[PDB]
Design a protein around this ligand. Sequence first.
Ligand SMILES: CC(=O)N[C@@H]1[C@@H](O)[C@H](O[C@@H]2O[C@H](CO)[C@@H](O[C@@H]3O[C@H](CO)[C@@H](O[C@@H]4O[C@H](CO)[C@@H](O)[C@H](O)[C@H]4NC(C)=O)[C@H](O)[C@H]3NC(C)=O)[C@H](O)[C@H]2NC(C)=O)[C@@H](CO)O[C@H]1O
Ligand SMILES: CC(=O)N[C@@H]1[C@@H](O)[C@H](O[C@@H]2O[C@H](CO)[C@@H](O)[C@H](O)[C@H]2NC(C)=O)[C@@H](CO)O[C@H]1O
Length: 243
Amino acid sequence: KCNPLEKTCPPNKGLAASTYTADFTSASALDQWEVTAGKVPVGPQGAEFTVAKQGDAPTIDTDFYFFFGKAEVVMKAAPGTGVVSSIVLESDDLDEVDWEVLGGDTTQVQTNYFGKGDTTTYDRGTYVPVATPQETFHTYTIDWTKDAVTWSIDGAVVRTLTYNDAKGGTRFPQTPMRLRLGSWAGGDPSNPKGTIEWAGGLTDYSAGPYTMYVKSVRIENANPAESYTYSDNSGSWQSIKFD
Ligand SMILES: CC(=O)N[C@@H]1[C@@H](O)[C@H](O[C@@H]2O[C@H](CO)[C@@H](O[C@@H]3O[C@H](CO)[C@@H](O[C@@H]4O[C@H](CO)[C@@H](O)[C@H](O)[C@H]4NC(C)=O)[C@H](O)[C@H]3NC(C)=O)[C@H](O)[C@H]2NC(C)=O)[C@@H](CO)O[C@H]1O
Ligand SMILES: CC(=O)N[C@@H]1[C@@H](O)[C@H](O[C@@H]2O[C@H](CO)[C@@H](O)[C@H](O)[C@H]2NC(C)=O)[C@@H](CO)O[C@H]1O
């Protein structure tokens, strides 16, 4: 994880196709993914992100990066107090767009972003109404262009971030991003008071295994390439070299 605003890092492996599809009911679905933590079994309901015990943070990263386009995930959130179901887009410069569902909040899901790992205040967050995310599969779409990031649920736009809303684009996500899917306990007793408070309370690991399900992943690469290179330390999209 070398940050190109701080130094010169090697190229990011890119998705050299205009679309990527993963149906997680097949075994060879994690061929272009890495299991970064825990075990992630593949079931009849798709890939399973289970918080069974303390420290369980099962995550999968794509091997590839994409430079603008679409990320669509069909997910059922994990239940349980303090359990976080996360759909994360992140670049090496720490540009990020994400979706977070909390097990005890049955009426909403959170949308969030940051530019260049800048979490000056936690004012980049938005709660949007969703019907029983822990009991119903929903399609979480992020549309990503130079002009705006759009968050949609089951084909309905629920949030738009334009380039200038991100401090005139100084904090807009515009660098090659990999998709991470995972569940973790934000209510882990060992987290800061503020994280446990945010996650909607403490996690009772005894009270069940809590499973997050991802049936499918759809990625559209607006700029298909074998690799992406950060030319400068500007962290801007104009500084991304590829062919
Ligand atoms: C700035 C910001 O707000 N960023 C958010 C992201 O943090 C967040 O992604 C999730 O973040 C959590 C908390 O950091 C993370 O959970 C942690 O995962 C790591 C690795 O799996 C664990 O660290 C390891 O712990 C083991 C113990 O089993 C050690 O042996 C090992 O040495 C540790 N390794 C390292 C490198 O530290 C933590 O234990 C674990 N914490 C908990 C409480 O479970 C999630 O995995 C992140 N999830 C995803 C999908 O990225 C993101 C999503 O909510 O949102 C951003 O806003
Ligand atoms: C110690 C600390 O930073 N505590 C609180 C924050 O954790 C919390 O922000 C939330 O952090 C999570 C990652 O650990 C994110 O997944 C989550 O999206 C993020 N929430 C927001 C709104 O960005 C905030 C929440 O208000 O409170 C801090 O005090």
